[PDB]
């Protein structure tokens, strides 16, 4: 929190077997998971709950 800028760094780990064909789409796969990491991640709360406002 004390850091001036809030940054998250993520790295995908490849399996023991080497996939020569996935290198072409390696960056594309990252573009896929990041998009799903922006949408399909529920940090906290109940689904279908857009916003909550406090009233007295």
């Amino acid at each position: 929190d004390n850091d001036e800028k809030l940054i998250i760094r993520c790295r995908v780990v490849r399996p023991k077997s080497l996939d020569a064909e996935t290198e072409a789409e390696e960056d594309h796969m990252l573009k896929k998971i990041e998009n799903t990491m922006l949408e399909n991640i529920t940090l906290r709360g109940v689904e279908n709950i857009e916003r909550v406002v406090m009233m007295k």
Binding site: E21, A24, E25, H28
Partner: protein, 118 residues
Amino acid sequence: VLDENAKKLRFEEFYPWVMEDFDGYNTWVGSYEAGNSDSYVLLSVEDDGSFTMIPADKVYKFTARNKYATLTIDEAEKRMDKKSGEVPRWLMKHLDNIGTTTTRYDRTRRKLKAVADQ
């Protein structure tokens, strides 16, 4: 009824200009341009410092053809269909090694070398 000028242009431009070298290394196809076909004029510089006047007739735009082994309509259509989620990023390189989808320049060089060897 069709305007005479257009019909002549259509018949004249039915087959576009094609410029090919001896070895097929360069293949350019010309396309007619009508925006400024008749609004241009040429000035040819003589070998004595003088200028010569020649009216301009037509303007042709030439684009290179078959320089990097383009695929065919049937091959292109097969890939577009849902045979796979997305086309491979290096599909062109992969098929280059297999030997399929060669170029006219390479297709002619190999045949010429196939004769010089004997």
